Amino acid sequence: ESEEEDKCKPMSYEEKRQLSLDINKLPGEKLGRVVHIIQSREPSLKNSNPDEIEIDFETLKPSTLRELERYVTSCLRKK
């Protein structure tokens, strides 16, 4: 479930911060897609209550963190 590792760089709170807000600014439909990333990326996830998700960057991996940034940035755009 890697095939790289080295390619996956760490995510600083700085970037994550602007991401937390951005992801929240996204529309409902956009949220469903994002939440799915962590829901499938996180092993502990997939609880009996799929209508809830606990995203904790404190324990979350860098792969998932950036994963959302790539989806939020691709939609929100910036340039």
């Binding site: 709170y13 994550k16 992801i23 949220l31 939440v35 799929p50 998700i53 995203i55 404190e58």
Partner: peptide, 17 residues
């Protein structure tokens, strides 16, 4: 629609339907 609410954590985003 879906909702979201951060916590005391440094960056814990709680997403829920």
């Amino acid at each position: 629609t879906w909702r979201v609410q951060r916590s005391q954590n440094p960056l814990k985003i709680r997403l829920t339907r």
